[PDB]
């Protein structure tokens, strides 16, 4: 039940740090690559919707190259977060798909992310592809509004492994601390009897910060730090305190 | 609504963090007492039922005398635990509540924990007294076997506030990862629509130990920790609930 990449297992142990890189250009992506040589985390996700020139597949490869050869030894995640999902701007199908598979066939990333909800046939094609390639599918669904139901969170997860995801992932937004319950609940649920590889799940925003510091104990095998939000010697920190208690 | 005692304000900002004190003999509690005082914590609780003179009255107001002059600042919670409750040894009702009767009206504590399931008539008795001497109650119930119901808990939380407790207390025993969210959501469904004063809540065992942590989030207003299952080392509880707090 577990993912291996570049010598972090995820789906044992103590959930794995998440960090992101949310730079616009070369030189911004290049800086913070630097700054995160100071930083203990165990995953390096690029947000390439924060990137300004997404437009050019050579621009994006060259940066996602620049990001590589920064930090060789680290997973990295590919993640352009359409703005359908709470990221920074819009993306056609199809250029989100080229982008991807770029990504994916120019060995220059370990995992991609991919959204779900983009549409049945461009999953299967971008998952088979991804696969071929000795890359993982973190497949992903957001929620920035609200939360669903236990019922409808635990259906998408079960429906992100049936289409061949690596590691399921949902993020919800709750609106009252009982939503954040039901986020704890749903994935409970897939950690105790549907799930056979590992899966992702986070409440966002400050009343979903106990999500991102209890997927030990419910079924998360990782949570995002920053170098709501929580910074990655915090998170570390907690995450040993609970994995030793 | 909120209880202070000593300058500390007991359900307002982040969990009260307890520390039980558990000498067998009054040089165990002197000692503890003295080596104490260097730690971190909120409230001190006497674990009176691990006291193996608990037969003379005088040797446990003595013990917690000592307490006191050691810690003359802090918060001082005097905590019998039944044997019928997970305690360390059986005694009859009677020396139960002349224990607690003698421990409120000595001044030496803050605070006295009684035990909900210890009879209606008793425990309201045992209540007046300690408001009639300024000495708050926090109010218990455990099960050490199973996580009861979230409706079933909170019916034991509501009692203890209709029987004037000043501080709700339940612990219960997880048997599996979803009794803990069990414990959790019957927490906030006290915070949101019962509890109208400080409650306090946790699983226990290693599987519970989320909810010693959660409190600020959910609504438990205080939690325990170790000084030296599930009660982890008080630097590291303070560490968690800071972090939570200001996140
Ligand atoms: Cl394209
Ligand atoms: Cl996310
Ligand atoms: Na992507
Ligand atoms: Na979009
Ligand atoms: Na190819
Ligand atoms: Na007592
Ligand atoms: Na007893
Ligand atoms: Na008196």
Same mark, same amino acid.
């Given at each position: 039940?577990?993912?291996?990449?570049?010598?972090?297992?995820?789906?044992?142990?103590?959930?794995?740090?998440?960090?992101?890189?949310?730079?616009?250009?070369?030189? %911004? &992506?290049?800086?913070? *690559?630097?700054?995160? /040589?100071? =930083?203990?985390? +165990? !995953?390096?996700?690029?947000?390439?919707?924060?990137?300004?020139?997404?437009?050019?597949?050579? %621009? &994006?490869?060259?940066? *996602?190259?620049?990001? /590589?050869? =920064?930090?060789? +030894? !680290?997973?990295?995640?590919?993640?352009?977060?359409?703005?359908?999902?709470?990221?920074?701007?819009?993306?056609?199908?199809?250029?989100?798909?080229?982008?991807?598979?770029?990504?994916?066939?120019?060995?220059?990333?370990?995992?991609?992310?991919?959204?779900?909800?983009?549409?049945?046939?461009?999953?299967?094609?971008?998952?088979?592809?991804?696969?071929?390639?000795?890359?993982?599918?973190?497949?992903?669904?957001?929620?920035?509004?609200?939360?669903?139901?236990?019922?409808?969170?635990?259906?998408?997860?079960?429906?992100?492994?049936?289409?061949?995801?690596?590691?399921?992932?949902?993020?919800?937004?709750?609106?009252?601390?009982?939503?954040?319950?039901?986020?704890?609940?749903?994935?409970?649920?897939?950690?105790?009897?549907?799930?056979?590889?590992?899966?992702?799940?986070?409440?966002?925003?400050?009343?979903?910060?106990?999500?991102?510091?209890?997927?030990?104990?419910?079924?998360?095998?990782?949570?995002?730090?920053?170098?709501?939000?929580?910074?990655?010697?915090?998170?570390?920190?907690?995450?040993?305190?609970?994995?030793?208690?």
């Amino acid at each position: 039940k577990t993912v291996t990449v570049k010598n972090l297992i995820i789906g044992e142990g103590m959930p794995k740090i998440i960090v992101s890189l949310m730079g616009r250009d070369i030189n %911004s &992506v290049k800086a913070e *690559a630097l700054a995160y /040589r100071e =930083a203990t985390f +165990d !995953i390096l996700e690029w947000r390439v919707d924060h990137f300004m020139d997404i437009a050019s597949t050579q %621009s &994006v490869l060259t940066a *996602a190259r620049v990001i /590589r050869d =920064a930090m060789p +030894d !680290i997973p990295l995640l590919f993640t352009f977060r359409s703005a359908k999902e709470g990221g920074e701007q819009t993306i056609t199908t199809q250029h989100y798909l080229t982008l991807n598979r770029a990504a994916i066939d120019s060995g220059l990333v370990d995992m991609i992310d991919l959204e779900l909800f983009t549409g049945d046939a461009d999953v299967k094609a971008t998952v088979d592809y991804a696969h071929a390639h000795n890359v993982y599918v973190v497949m992903s669904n957001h929620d920035f509004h609200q939360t669903p139901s236990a019922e409808e969170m635990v259906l998408r997860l079960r429906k992100m492994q049936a289409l061949g995801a690596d590691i399921p992932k949902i993020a919800v937004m709750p609106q009252s601390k009982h939503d954040v319950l039901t986020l704890l609940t749903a994935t409970l649920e897939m950690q105790q009897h549907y799930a056979d590889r590992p899966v992702i799940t986070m409440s966002m925003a400050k009343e979903g910060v106990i999500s991102r510091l209890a997927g030990e104990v419910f079924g998360s095998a990782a949570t995002f730090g920053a170098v709501g939000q929580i910074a990655v010697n915090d998170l570390r920190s907690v995450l040993m305190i609970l994995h030793n208690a």
